[PDB]
Each structure stands twice: as C-alpha cells, then as structure tokens.
Design a protein around this ligand. Structure first.
Ligand code: ADP
Ligand code: ADP
Ligand code: MG
Ligand code: MG
Lengths: 363, 168, 283, 414, 7, 372, 188, 7
C-alpha cells in the first residue's frame, strides 16, 4: 500500500478523524494538507506564515484544530473559520528550539517537547485571548524527543536523551479536575518528578500508553525495547536482538506491540502475562518485496558518462523492501484507539507514505 | 582478499553500517541550528565513543558517532618515503576538487590520513549503501593506485635515462 | 626542452635587440643588467664608464682559481680573439665588444658569446684529453668542485680517460626520487651502441677518491663515465662536454617533469574516483 | 656577492619577466602555451595522459604561435584559472629555459589580481614549495608596485606615498587608492571589462563593416588598436556626424600582410578609431551587467574613505597600464572628475549660505613613461629591500602549518 | 641479448 | 606469514600459486598489449594498457608484444605491470603478507638478476624472496636426485646434469631454439602451402594450431613418402571466421626442426646431440646413472612420440650394450611450479631466504653468491 | 591511400579509369620528404609547394601535402592500419638476423630495384634512417642506378646468355617423366 | 564535386 507525496523527506504527519485528510511537512518553511479523491490523493490547501522549519504537527478529532510546533521558538494553533484556515499566536518562552507536540484526548491542553531542556503545557484562556504557557524543568537535564498522553490527561511521559523515560503529573486546576484513583501514584501537582527509569538503557525516541493505563513501553538507540508494567510491583521487562535501532513505539492490544525504525520494515513484539518477558515477531507487514528493471537504451549510455555503464539501480535491499523505504520516522493508528487497531500506518523519511494491516495477514 | 583483507573490510563495513544511522537534532546549545555535532564537540551528551579497526601498526582507521553526523578517518599502509609522498600528493589533489564529492572533508585529521564525513543532509539526497561501498572501494584501490604511480615514475626515469644516454 | 640548452638566450636576445638598431647613428643605449644561470654563477653586463660605445660582459666563476692556476692561453685566441681584456669585476674573465669597429658577423659572434660558461669550463677537460692524446706523461689528476657542495674529479691516464660525479640532494623530499632516478641510469643500455659504461655507487666510494679530498659522506652517490677515444675524438668532443656539463640541471629538470607527470596522472584518476562515487546519487 | 632574487609578473596578457636590480624587463612574452593534444574523444577522464616523454613535447612563448599542428591554449582568463597544470608547465619552462634560475637558491615574488580567491594562492604556493622548493616566497597586489614606479615621473627625492592607481590588464583593470603607504581594503572595486573585450568588439564590428581578410589572421588585423589607430573623444555624436559628413580625410587605411599566401590585403578604418577606447567610459556596450562608468566610480571610491585622505588622493592619479596608453584619456578623466566634484561642492555650499569661497579642489592627471609596465620595477625594488628577505614566508612555515601562510589578503580580517 | 641474437 | 608464493616467469606463460597446493591458481600468458587505433567513442577512457586473458580476448585491435624474449627480459615496464596484475587482480594478496619465489633459466646475465631483485625489494617491499633454477625444481617435483633435465621451454631449452647431492655446472648447455622459432617456421611453411599469417593475432592462432594438430615423426623419410600418398594424413582446422585450413606434412615438419636446426639456418645441433655431448663431458661412472634417468619438462615436449624418437636416437648414438629409459610424466607442464612449492614447503629452506635487512646492508650482489 | 586523401581534399575518384589517372598523377607529381614534420610546417605556409595537373577533361587539380604524404606510408604503415614496420625497419631486422661478419658487407652494398623506388630523395631518406638506426662508427652507402625499372629483365637476359645455364633448363621429357614437383627442387 | 560527380 505504498504511496509517494514528495521526493524530499517529510518531517511529521497528522490525520483527521475520518482518515480523509493528510498533513505532510515538505521539509520547508510551510506545511501542506492532502485530501482523498476517490482512490487518489490531491492537494487542497496551502498554509504558510512560519519562517522556520516545521517539525511537529497534531490534529484534534473534534475541534478540527491543527498546531504547528517547530523552530523559531513559536507555535501557532490553526483553526477553521468557514472555508479557510487562520493562525493563532501562542507564547512558549523558549530559547533553543521545539521539535515534538501532542494534544490531549479531551482537547483542553497541548504539550511541546521543547529543546531548551524544558517541557511546556498550555491551555485555552478567553480573558487575554492568548495561550498561556507553563514550564516543567525540575528533573529534565537534556532534550525531549517523544511525548505521549494518558486518557485522564493528567499523566505525561516525555522521553529524553539521558537514559530516562519518566512519567510526570501535570494538573492545571484552572481547566482540570481531580482525576480518579490510579495505581501509579497520587496525581500530584504540576511540575514534579513522579518516577524515573529503573536504570540506564539507551536513549528514548518514542512512548506508548494503554487504555487501562497500567503498561508503558518505549524504545531506545541501543536496540532495546522496554515495558514498564505498573500493575505489578513496578515489574520491568526487557528484550533485545540484532536489529538496528528502533525509532517508534505503539501497540495493538494489552499484550501486542509494534515498532519500526532504521530496519526499513515493521517489527512486531509481544508481552507475556506473568513471565515478565517479551518475544519477537518478524516482518508482520508482509513476506518480502520484489525487484525489476528495464533496458533503457538511453540510460545505458547516459549512466556511463557519470557512473559505470554496467551500473544500475539494483540493490540488495530490493528483495526485502530495503531499497527505497529509507528508514521510518514514526507510527500512527487508523481505527478506534490502541485496543484493536485493525490498520496501522507509518511515516518514511524517503518523502512518501505507506499503509499496512493487522488482519489481512491472517497468521 | 580472502586471507589478507576480507575480514578487515567486513568488520569495518559492519561498523560503518551500524554507525551510519543518523537523525536531525535541533541545536541544543546555540539558538536555532542544525549544524554537525561531531565537529563542534559542544555537548558530550550526543557523542559516542570512538572505535578503531586495524591490523598493523602503521595502518589504522577511526569511526566516530553522533546524531547529526558520523566521521571516519583512515590511515594508509605506507612503507617507503616515496609511498608517503605519493599518498600525500594524491590526497591533496583529491582535496582540491572535493566540492563535487559532497561527502569528503577539506583537510585530514592531524596525525592521520584522509577522513570522510556523513550527515543527515547527505543520507536522503544520496543513497546509503552506495557511500559505504565507495569508501570500501577506495580503501582497496589505494594500494593499486600507489603501485601504479610507482611503476609510472620508474618508467619515466628509465625513459629519460635512455633518451639521454643515446647521444653519447 | 629535453636536452637543457647551453646557449643562454638572455644574452642572445639582448644583443639581437641592441644590434638590430646598431646602424641607426649615435645610439648608445646605456645598458646595465645582472643575470644568473646554473651552477650558482652570476653574470654582469655594464659599460666600463660613461663611454657607452663599449659593452662589457663578465663572469663570477666559483672555481675560477683552478682555471687561473691551470692557464687557459688556448681559450684566449681560439674562440675569443682580441676582444678579451683583463678581469675587472672579481678577478674573473670579462669580455667586451668594440662597437666603433665594424662588426661584420652577427650570428656567429652572438653564438660564441652565448656559451661563455661552457667555453671556459672546457679549458680543463679538453686540455686533459689533449694530454692523453699527445702522449705527454699523464698530467696529474685534478678535482674541480664548483659552487655546489658536491665535487667533480677526473683522471687522465693512457689508453682512456675517466670522470666521476658526486651527487648531493638538499631537500628530504627529492632525495629518494633522485636515488630512484639514478638507479636506472647505470643500467639503461639497450638503445645505445657507441656509448660509455655507466655505474652507480653510494655506500662505497670509489678507490680513486680515497686520497683525493672530494665529496665524502653518507648520503652522497657516485656516478662514473668511462671515456674512450671513439667518443672523445676531435669530432664527438663538444657533444660529450655539453652533455656532461648539462648533466646536473638535466637531472633536476627531468625530476620536476616527472613530478608534474605524476601530478597529471593522479588528477586523471580523481575523475575515475568521482565517477565511481556518483553511483550514490539518485536518478 | 649575494645572488639576486627573481621578479615575475604573471597575468592573463603578456607575462613580464626578468631579474631584480635591473632597469628593463628583459623578457616580455605572451601566455600562449603549446600542447600535443589532438582529437581524442575521451577527454574528460584522461585529459591528456601523454605517453612517454610526449608530455613535455610542447613549446612556449612567441615561438608557440607559429606551430600550426598543436593547440594554442591560454591558461589564464582575467585572473581566475580553470586548469593550473598548464601554468605549472609554463613556470618550469620559463624558469629553466629563459630565466635559468635554480629555485632552491633563489627567491620568487609573484603578482596576482586583487580578486584572486584565497584557494588559488594557497594551492599555487603549495605547488611552488613542493616542486620548486623555493626558500622564500611573497605575493602582493600590483598597485603598490605601480605607485613605487610612479616616483620616476618627477622629483624622486620628494617622497610621495599618497595617491591612487587604476591599472589596466588583458582581462581586468582595477582601482586601488594608497593613503601614505596604507591602502583602504573596502574601497576597492573590480572592473570586468578590460583591453581584450574591446578588441572582440572591434573585430565583431569589422567582420561586417568590411571584407577582404582571412578568418585566421583576424587578431593581427584587429590590433590596429595598439597602433596610432585609436583616439579618445570628448563627444560621441559630434565626431559621428563629422565622419558621416566628410568621410574622406578622417578615414584611414590598412596594409597588412597575409601570413599564408603572402598576398597583400587592405581595408579602410572607420568608427572604431574611437569607439573602442570610448567603451572604457561606456562599458555598457560590451558587458550588459556592468552599466557603470569609470570616472564616477573613481570619485565614489575616493568619497568612501576618511576626510583627511580625500584631498591628497585626487591630486595623484597615476597613468600606468597598457590599456591606458590611449591618447587624451587623462584629459577626459580629469575633466569629468573636476566637473562632478565642483558640482558636488556647489551643491554643498548652496544649502548653507555664506559669502566665503572655498579653494577649488585640484585634480591633476600625470602622464609619464613606464605605462606599459609598472609592476616590474616595483618587484625589483621589492627584491632589493633587505626586509623582503625577512618578511618572505619560510620553508618551515609551510612544512607543518600548510600553505595558508600565503592566504593573507588586504581586504580580509577577523 | 646485447651482442649476438636480439634479446 | 603462513605460506609463500611461487611465480614462474615463463618465456611465454606465467604460473603462480600458493605454496602447498598441487595445482596453480593463476595461469595466463605473458601479454602486454596497447591500443593501435585512435578511438572515437566518448563513453570509455579504458585502460590504455592491457594484460592477461583480457589481452588475448581483444587481441584484434592491439599490438601484442612479449615482455620476455628467449629467457631474457627486454622491457622492464611490461614485466612490472604483469607482476602488479598477477599480485593484485588475480592473487589479491599483498606482497608484504607472504614472500615470493622466482625462477630463471641458467646462464642468464647477472644484470637481469640484480635488477629483478632490486625491483622486488624496493617496489613491493617483499619480506623475503629467493632465486632458483627450473631444472632443479623439476627434479624436486619428480622425486628424484639423479638424472638429466630437458627443460625445453617456450623461450629457451637447456640441460643440467646432476648427481646424488651435487650438480655439474661445467656441463650445462643452453640452446636458444624454443617454441617461438617453431611458430615462426610454421608460419613460413603455412605460407608455402597457401595460407598467410603475419600479425600477432594470427601468431596466437598458429600457436593454438600447433598446440592442437602437431606431432613428431619416428622416421622423416618414411613420413614424407606416406605424405606423397596424401589420403590419410591431412587434417582440417576451423578458424574463428569459419574458414577451414587443411594441414598435411606441416604437422610433422615443424617439430623436426628441434632435431634438425639447419632448417632455420642455425649452425648448431639437435637436442639429442646436445644431451649426448653433455653426458659425455661428465665422468664415466655417472654416465650409467644419467642414462638410466632422463627427466624432461617444459611445454615444448608434449608432442606425442617425442619420447620414443629421443630414446631411439640416444640408443643409436650410445653403445648398444645397456638400457636407456625415457620418463615422460603426464604433468610436465607445471613440474617447475610443483618443485618450487615443494622446495618452499621444506623446513630447512625456511632460513635460506634473503631478507630486506641483509640485502640492504650487503647489496644486490648477494644473490650472485646465493647458490650461484 | 592517394585516392582516399584526394577525397579529403575535395576530388573524388572511384572507378578503375580514375585509378589509372591517379596512378599517372602519382608517377608524375610525387616525392619523398626528408623530414615529415618540417614538410608539414612548410605546407602550413602553402605558397611554394602546391602544383597543378591537367586532367583529360581539362579540369585542373591542385595537389599540396599529398605529394609527400602517400610515399611516407612506406615508412609508416600505420597510416593504412597495417600492424607492421617500414622498409627501413624490415631491412635492419633482416640484416641483423644475418651473421655478424657479413653485416659489414651487407651495409657496404645495398641494391634496390622496382618501380616503387623511383621517388626522388628516397635513397637519401633510407640512408639517413639506416645510419640513425645502425651504429655511427662505419659508412653506409646507397646505390641507386637510374635504370632500376628493368633491372630484373636485364638480369634475366644476362643469366640466359650464360653458357653454364644452357643445361640448367627444364625440358619436356624430364618434366613428363618426373612431374610438376620437379620445379620445386630446382633451386628452391 | 569539382572532379567526378557534379557537386
Ligand atoms: N600601446 C597600446 N595600445 C593599445 N592597447 C595596448 C597597448 N599596449 C598594450 N595594450 C593593450 O593592453 C593589454 C596588455 O596590458 P597588460 O596589463 O600588460 O596585460 P596583463 O594584464 O597580463 O599585465 C594588451 O591586451 C594590449 O591590447
Ligand atoms: N598442449 C601443448 N602441446 C605442445 N606445445 C604446447 C602445448 N601447450 C603449450 N605448448 C607450448 O609450450 C609453450 C608454453 O609452455 P611453457 O612451459 O609455460 O613455456 P615456459 O617454459 O616459458 O613455462 C607454448 O609456447 C606452447 O608453444
Ligand atoms: Mg595586468
Ligand atoms: Mg619456462
């Protein structure tokens, strides 16, 4: 189900509620929106007032708002007014950069994984017609690359590059209420460290939560996968293999798990019930790819001038779909939530996009 | 090269493939930038420990690591003074036209022979395995090039001598 | 140029420019120029005094003392006639042209003056060859070290003549290249029929130089050319003298030419390397 | 009895040559270089790779023009050089055949245009130190050499360091002021039009306005410019109608000689007698990018430097360079500069009233010999100065630091 | 050879 | 440093391989060809010089020249190029890793040996090497200590009488006649038949023809008479272009030049006469042993029936009171290489090598005293 | 080759009649060049070397460098593409293959014959080339009789006139009894 | 052409 939207890479992707609209960063000072047309994709809009590079996008299932969180230490909350899109300036008080962003299930606040050693949380205010920003800086010691949220919206996990993957506890009493009892802790006030990684296991590039809110998993640059099971006495499970570093995290159900990265194709994992150990699953996407070429009498002589005439586009990665699918940027979900996920999509640094399935394989 | 160079090439190729992974990291220390981290040496947070793949005292290679770039430095197997001179001159002539390469540096690391450079800006606009293949191929072909240069200079000396002696 | 020339073209050019307008009345064209050539010798052209009707040429030979001791009376009348006068600059041979007297020849005189350095250098080698030819008792061997720190020695016995060369290289870069260059000099003989034997020695100086205080050391090679009358008679004498005198600069120039050749070859190979690299960029 | 150093002034046009401590550049030859190239087709992966000794089988200089089986290929093009292997070949050929100087026991001074990039200077210095092993080297802009040579015009004993020089060139003519030995770095402008494109325009017009010449012997026909055949013109249209009215006495004739069949061919001389040299003050004719005169450029560059130096600078403008040999050039430049400066002074006085009268600014152009070559004498005096032997970069400096010692430029600094 | 026969 | 490489610079072919293997790993002819035409196409700047099987394949547009002529090198650049090719492209083994063994014909000029040693020690900086004789290696391969060697190579034919534990340097005879002269004579006679061949490509073609359709004749006159009845001896060969050439008497005429050098005009004697003279010059007692053992090697002695003719001629010349035996192993082509490999494998020979230190301190003259 | 080059000049000749015409042209207006490069340079100054020939139809053809280009093919067979050597090289190789003592006599006597060696200056060029190749210690002489065209016929007539040769002939009786193979053994 | 054929 491969498709191409641009030769150059793409930074981040965002989708709407009906999976009919797409957001693609062209690796330039703008962002584009693509819409479905029968069985085809075509450009619809063109949003641009940012003079820097965009590196984070997200979508609101109900509010239909889009946030551009990137360089220039700024962030604009896009909203739809009739048949056109307009910006909404926000203030974040950042000095270095901002990469990743994420909204909340209830659409009341959004967080930015800023590169200034700080994590910012903001909420809507009608008084000054602005977006106020708070800061979390106590335990943070380096950049944060991945953020994920919990149903109640009070627990936040902010992966960083300091061997740690920590949950936080943010509660703005202005637009938040007391959450129900949770196994983790006490839902303490904003700006505090709840718990830290058990030990040093590589950096962090992604995080994933569960509907029951009792299991957290993340990946690392050290070719490792972790699963913090809080239902038990903070049982921690680990797994490793010879695969290249992963750069994404997501799971299907309470036991499944999915990930992708420089391996160029999806890799599937699973978690046991009581054994406290994971396992491995190989190329759940498909068996393998194929390769082809042509004579190209013009090319046979065109390539000899610069490259060798006998040379060609064939590569060892053609057989296992490792030729053009250069790396994987992140992952998303298609249907429902993180319970069944009948379909899953992934982003590619090649500048394209692709879709997959979880039941079409039919074991 | 099965019994002489094959294992060395395999090991260095595997190391490069593992360390060829790169990603874009917004500048953490200097306002807003995406400049290479290895050259700056600002934060030890991103840097990875150096590695070396070598089998003799006078020949060596170095493999660096970072989010933005990976740097590799080689040391050739030069024995005689003519070999050193020819290697230096050939590398200098390679430097003088390094702009078209888009991969190579502009001056070798101190105390070492030529070194290369990679970045996230050179990984998508260019293929991945082709670059490592080219680095390998250069490593093998250096000896051929130096031997060919040596025989060429010897032939030149022979021809000039023959041309002069005829007059007598 | 392959065989380095012996005629300095600077004097040829300046004398041609002067003489082409000579028949134009009272035209002094005061000239005062200083030059330099191989062997670390300085030339000088300058009028003797305010009288610009006479032009003088002089030399600053390093080993001039040996020439004066030997005596070059042959050179004072054979090649140079009455237009040679006692030294002025530094006790070194200096000539002048008398413009008031009609100069009949134009090219012959200029050519004769062009080879001044070799013309004076031959005074010793040709005389040694005459000594061995005439049957006179073999004249005592002599050593002639010119401006270069190296040395030259010659032995003139009966039935043959000998010459040995001492080589010194200054920069460490060119030492090995010159060693390689001279290694194949002693062997290349498949394209020469009537040519002398050639040999190379650096570790063991020849037994001839043990007594003589010639160039002795460690990083010094030796080259000897055996001489026989078949290539040292009155016909093939000038050619041999020119070849031996122009030996040093010949080696130097061809070393630089080889350097340029290898530079060109590596520059050519860079293109092949770039072509191989270009396989990484997409279509 | 110390050996003199060597003086060389390389460039796009006729390369000057000779030794230091002398009053006349002995050798003045073009940059033409021969080569045994022919028609291969594989010319971008083996440019030449001449087998055996054929690599050096090439002549040089005036003798290289009359070799009709090789290729005359100029290596230089208005300072910048594409391939420098030909330059190295020319340098070795000259030093050995013509100069006959051993590099290991001599000092070489070289001259380059001010716009030369640092890379070219660095790499040529590296080439010299590697191959020639010259003990010392020094590179400097040619303006100061021209200023030093200008002292011979009158009153040599009267030291006069201030002034400005607008030098010519085969492909470049530059403007550089001097303020008591110290020049201004930012007040330098590079002019692309020079004494070559002028001849291109001359031949282009001639190939249509006249017939009776062979394609080969074109430049020799186009070199009427170097003859008495070009006068400058205070007015353009006036002389145009003068020619179009009489067109009998003002027209000259050419009597060149063919170099192949030895058959005489003649052509008349028309409007090109002045248009070429007039292009200097109207560069828009040839180069569309640079639609900017010269005299106004001179005043602008002289008006972008401190107040205390503006006054003496206008008083000393040196006429040095081949392209400046045109008659009445100085009169036109002086008159234009005087007009513009007087107008500026009057405008400045108009806004602020006063019965005073400032002493008029004096602008004078000096005509003298040495115009064809003003860089050689400067290099000779450069070599003769003992301090040159101390400022020259040494071998050990290049040994480990690299060839960056020659990267110093007058318009750079951090 | 050098004398006698070619080689 | 586990094994050594043995290279045989044959006058017409090069054999190389590792020390220990029973068969060579590289067998290509000594050809150094260069383009003869101008070249027009732009998409190829390829290899101004050509060497090896590549030269054989594209020989139609190249001026093939053999670097080695009759056992003595004429062009050193070509030999260095072939050495580099064999070391790198084919063997893919660096010179420093292992030492090299070289072989040469007897009675060769000392200049060739000194130049070869100097080039090997300077250019490739081999850790150590040695110089030997093909005949002694033939003895080692044959597993015998006494006999007479008939090393009839492509460029030189020579004999070296030997006895138990010692040799006889004063009874060595070298004959310039070899395969190249046979090929030239074959071309000349093929001209008399009606087929013309001049250039080097047709030289290779005629070489193959001789390799495939030549044999020796027990009796010359009887074979000529049977040729007069030419209805059972003529054979046909298929040329690359498809033309068919019929060869009759030429099959058994060219080989007879070995026994009758007068055909080419050389004032010498045949191999039988030279071997008889060499054996006679030896001591009387060792003559019996030399007769009882006669080893032959080289690519010029594979013609069927050569052994029988040699035996008949020697018995006719020698007294008819003893027994003369000819030994003709079916692998004489690579006997020299096998002997070199076995000699290198010998434990006692691990110290006889010549290393860089002693060579540099002493000089090139050391090899001269190393086993003559 | 002359036809091919005449094509490059601008004159075309294909059929056999023009072959005879070009043969006559070569017979009348061709000569050898002592130095190829010097002659080419002087041709660059083409004002004293070009010559005109009158065709049967009256057309005039001007021939320049072609006069001294085609004969050079003898010394440079590479022009036609033949991988061989020139006449000088072949003669040097033939003389070298001979015994050392007879080399002096062969050098001292060099007879040439045939219709292809009448080009003026050929003898001088051959002498210069042989002396350059041969050692410069002896004397090399070239003999060029002015009647070499019919030298073979004169020699045949003289041989027939010889009394001793009156018996070496081959008659019908011996030929019939022996067969055609007799001539093969008759003086090779 | 000039000689042979027209052109
Ligand atoms: N007397 C002259 N009249 C007109 N043009 C001249 C005259 N002398 C030189 N030129 C022109 O000036 C140019 C040479 O100036 P020059 O500066 O010496 O060249 P370069 O820049 O290499 O030093 C020549 O191209 C020539 O056309
Ligand atoms: N099958 C064969 N039969 C007869 N002669 C052969 C055969 N193969 C090669 N030859 C001849 O032997 C020569 C090559 O054998 P070789 O022993 O390698 O020569 P060398 O002595 O230089 O090693 C060739 O020149 C060829 O003429
Ligand atoms: Mg200039
Ligand atoms: Mg052999």
């Amino acid at each position: 189900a491969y498709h191409s939207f641009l030769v150059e890479p793409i930074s981040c992707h965002a989708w709407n509620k009906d999976r009919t609209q797409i957001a693609i960063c062209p690796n330039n000072h703008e962002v584009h929106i693509y819409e479905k047309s029968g069985n085809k994709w075509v450009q619809v809009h063109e949003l641009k007032e940012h003079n820097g590079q965009v590196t984070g996008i997200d979508w609101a299932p109900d509010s239909n708002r889009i946030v551009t969180c990137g360089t220039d230490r700024n962030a604009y909350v896009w909203t739809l007014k009739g048949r056109t899109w307009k910006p909404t300036l926000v203030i974040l008080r950042i000095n270095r950069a901002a990469r990743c962003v994420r909204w909340a299930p209830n659409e009341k606040k959004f967080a930015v994984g800023s590169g200034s050693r700080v994590i910012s949380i903001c909420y809507f205010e009608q008084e000054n017609d602005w977006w106020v920003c708070k800061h979390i800086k106590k335990p943070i010691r380096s950049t944060v690359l991945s953020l994920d949220w919990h149903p109640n919206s009070v627990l936040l996990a902010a992966g960083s590059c300091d061997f740690k993957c920590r949950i936080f506890s943010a509660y703005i009493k202005e637009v938040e209420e007391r959450p129900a009892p949770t196994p983790w802790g006490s839902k303490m006030p904003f700006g505090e460290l709840m718990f830290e990684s058990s030990s040093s296991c590589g950096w962090v590039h992604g995080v994933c939560f569960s509907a029951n809110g009792s299991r957290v998993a993340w990946v690392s640059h050290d070719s490792t996968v972790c699963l913090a099971d809080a239902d038990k006495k903070m049982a921690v499970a680990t797994l490793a293999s010879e695969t290249l570093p992963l750069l994404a995290v997501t799971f299907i159900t309470e036991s499944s798990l999915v990930a992708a990265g420089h391996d160029c194709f999806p890799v599937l994992f699973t978690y046991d019930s009581a054994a406290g150990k994971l396992s491995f699953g190989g190329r759940l996407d498909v068996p393998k790819q194929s390769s082809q070429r042509g004579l190209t009498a013009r090319e046979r002589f065109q390539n000899l001038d610069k490259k060798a005439s006998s040379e060609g586009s064939a590569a060892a990665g053609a057989g296992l779909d490792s030729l053009h699918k250069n790396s994987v940027s992140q992952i998303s979900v298609l249907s429902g939530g993180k319970a069944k996920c009948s379909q899953f999509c992934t982003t590619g640094m090649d500048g394209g996009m692709s879709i997959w399935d979880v039941r079409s394989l039919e074991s | 090269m099965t019994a002489t160079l094959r294992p060395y090439l395999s090991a260095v190729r595997a190391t490069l493939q593992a360390a060829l992974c790169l990603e874009n990291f917004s500048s953490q220390v200097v306002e807003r930038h995406n400049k290479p981290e290895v050259e700056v040496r600002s934060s030890k947070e991103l840097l990875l420990q150096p590695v070396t793949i070598s089998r003799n005292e006078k020949e060596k290679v170095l493999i660096e690591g970072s989010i933005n770039s990976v740097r590799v430095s080689i040391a050739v197997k030069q024995a005689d003074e003519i070999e050193k001179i020819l290697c230096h001159k050939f590398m200098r002539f390679m430097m003088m036209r390094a702009e078209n390469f888009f991969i190579l540096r502009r001056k070798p690391v101190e105390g070492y022979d030529i070194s290369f450079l990679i970045t996230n800006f050179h990984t998508e606009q260019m293929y991945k395995h082709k670059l490592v293949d080219f680095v390998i191929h250069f490593m093998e072909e250096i000896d051929k090039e130096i031997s060919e240069m040596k025989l060429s200079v010897n032939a030149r000396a022979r021809i000039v001598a023959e041309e002069f002696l005829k007059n007598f | 140029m392959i065989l380095l020339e012996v005629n300095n073209r600077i004097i040829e050019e300046t004398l041609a420019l002067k003489f082409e307008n000579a028949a134009a009345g009272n035209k002094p064209e005061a000239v005062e120029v200083t030059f330099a050539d191989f062997d670390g010798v300085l030339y000088h052209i300058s009028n003797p005094n305010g009288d610009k009707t006479k032009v003088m040429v002089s030399i600053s030979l390093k080993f001039y003392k040996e020439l004066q001791a030997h005596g070059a009376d042959e050179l004072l009348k054979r090649v140079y006639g009455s237009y040679l006068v006692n030294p002025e600059s530094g006790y070194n041979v200096s000539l002048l042209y008398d413009l008031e007297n009609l100069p009949a020849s134009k090219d012959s005189i200029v050519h004769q003056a062009g080879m001044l350095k070799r013309n004076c250098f031959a005074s010793v080698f040709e005389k040694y060859f005459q000594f061995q030819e005439e049957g006179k008792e073999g004249e005592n061997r002599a050593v002639i070290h010119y401006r270069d720190d190296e040395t030259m020695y010659v032995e003139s016995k009966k039935d043959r003549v000998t010459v040995v060369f001492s080589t010194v290289f200054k920069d460490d870069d060119d030492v090995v290249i010159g060693k390689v260059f001279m290694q194949e000099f002693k062997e290349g003989r498949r394209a020469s029929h009537t040519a002398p034997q050639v040999l190379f020695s650096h570790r063991e100086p020849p037994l001839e130089l043990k007594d003589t205080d010639a160039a002795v050391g460690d990083n010094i090679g030796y080259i000897t050319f055996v001489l026989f009358p078949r290539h040292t008679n009155a016909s093939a004498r000038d050619n041999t003298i020119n070849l031996i005198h122009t030996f040093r600069d010949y080696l130097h120039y061809h070393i630089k030419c080889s350097k340029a050749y290898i530079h060109t070859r590596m520059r050519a190979k860079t293109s092949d390397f770039l072509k191989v690299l270009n396989r990484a960029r997409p279509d | 009895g110390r050996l003199p150093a060597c003086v060389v002034d390389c460039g796009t046009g006729y390369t000057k040559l000779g030794y230091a401590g002398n009053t006349e550049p002995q050798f003045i030859i073009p940059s033409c270089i021969a080569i045994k190239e022919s028609a291969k087709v594989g010319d971008q992966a083996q440019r030449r790779v001449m087998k055996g000794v054929d690599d050096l089988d090439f002549f040089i200089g005036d003798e290289a023009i009359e070799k009709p089986t090789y290729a005359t290929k100029w290596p230089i093009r208005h300072g910048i050089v594409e391939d420098w292997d030909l330059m190295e070949r020319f340098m070795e050929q000259v030093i050995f055949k013509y100069l006959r100087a051993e590099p290991e026991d001599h000092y070489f001074l070289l001259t380059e245009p001010p716009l030369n990039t640092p890379e070219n200077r660095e790499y040529t210095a590296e080439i010299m130190f590697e191959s020639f092993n010259v003990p010392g080297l020094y590179i400097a802009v040619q303006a100061v050499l021209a200023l030093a040579a200008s002292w011979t015009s009158r009153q040599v004993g009267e030291r006069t360091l201030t002034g400005t020089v607008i030098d010519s060139g085969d492909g470049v003519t530059h403007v550089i002021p001097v303020a008591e030995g110290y020049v201004i770095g930012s007040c330098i402008k590079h002019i692309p039009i020079a004494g070559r494109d002028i001849t291109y325009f001359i031949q282009q017009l001639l190939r249509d306005r006249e017939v009776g010449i062979p394609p080969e012997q074109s430049l020799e026909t186009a070199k009427a410019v170097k003859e008495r055949y070009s006068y400058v013109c205070p007015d353009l249209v006036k002389e145009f109608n003068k020619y179009d009215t009489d067109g009998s006495k003002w027209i000259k004739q050419y009597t060149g000689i063919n170099a192949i069949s030895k058959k005489e061919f003649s052509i008349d001389v028309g409007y090109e007698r002045f248009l070429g040299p007039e292009i200097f003050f109207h560069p828009e004719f040839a180069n569309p990018d640079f639609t900017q005169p010269i005299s106004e450029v001179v005043d602008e560059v002289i008006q972008n430097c401190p107040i205390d130096v503006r006054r003496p600078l206008y008083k000393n403008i040196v006429l040095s360079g081949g392209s400046t040999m045109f008659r009445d050039f100085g009169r036109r430049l002086q008159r234009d500069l005087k007009r513009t400066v007087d107008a500026r002074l009057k405008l400045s006085e108009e806004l602020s009233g006063g019965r005073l009268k400032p002493k008029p600014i004096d602008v004078q152009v000096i005509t003298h010999h040495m115009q064809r070559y003003a860089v050689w004498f400067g290099g000779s005096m450069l070599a003769s100065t003992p301090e040159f032997y101390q400022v020259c970069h040494t071998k050990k400096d290049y040994e480990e630091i690299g060839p960056s010692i020659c990267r110093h430029n007058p318009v750079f600094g951090v | 050879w050098x004398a006698x026969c070619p080689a | 440093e586990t094994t050594a490489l043995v290279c045989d610079n044959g006058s017409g072919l090069v054999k190389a391989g590792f020390a220990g293997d029973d068969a060579p790993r590289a067998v290509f002819p000594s050809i150094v060809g260069r383009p003869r035409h101008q070249g027009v196409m732009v998409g190829m700047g390829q290899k101004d010089s050509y060497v090896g099987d590549e030269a054989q394949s594209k020989r139609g547009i190249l001026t093939l020249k053999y670097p080695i002529e009759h056992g003595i090198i004429t062009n050193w650049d070509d030999m260095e190029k072939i050495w580099h090719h064999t070391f790198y492209n084919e063997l893919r083994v660096a010179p420093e890793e292992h030492p090299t063994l070289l072989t040469e014909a007897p009675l060769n000029p000392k200049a060739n040996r000194e130049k070869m040693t100097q080039i090997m020690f300077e250019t490739f900086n081999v850790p150590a090497m040695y110089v030997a004789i093909q005949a002694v290696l033939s003895l080692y391969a044959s597993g015998r200590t006494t006999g007479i060697v008939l090393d009839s190579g492509d460029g030189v034919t020579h004999n070296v009488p030997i006895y138990e534990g010692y040799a006889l340097p004063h009874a060595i005879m070298r004959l310039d006649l070899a395969g190249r002269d046979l090929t030239d004579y074959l071309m000349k006679i093929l001209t008399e038949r009606g087929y013309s061949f001049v250039t080097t490509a047709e030289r290779e073609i005629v070489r193959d023809i001789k390799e495939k359709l030549c044999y020796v004749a027990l009796d010359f006159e009887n074979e000529m008479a049977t040729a007069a009845s030419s209805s059972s001896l003529e054979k046909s060969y298929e040329l690359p272009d498809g033309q068919v050439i019929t060869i009759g008497n030429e099959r058994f005429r060219c080989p007879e030049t070995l026994f009758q050098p007068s055909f080419i005009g050389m004032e010498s004697a045949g191999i039988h006469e030279t071997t008889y003279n060499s054996i006679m010059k030896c001591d009387i007692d060792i003559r019996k042993d030399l007769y009882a053992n006669n080893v032959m090697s080289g690519g010029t002695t594979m013609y069927p029936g050569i052994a029988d003719r040699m035996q008949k001629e020697i018995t006719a010349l020698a007294p008819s009171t003893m027994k003369i035996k000819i030994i003709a192993p079916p692998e004489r082509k690579y006997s020299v290489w096998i002997g070199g490999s076995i000699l290198a494998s010998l434990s006692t020979f691990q110290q006889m090598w010549i290393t860089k230190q002693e060579y540099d301190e002493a000089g090139p003259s050391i090899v001269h005293r190393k086993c003559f």
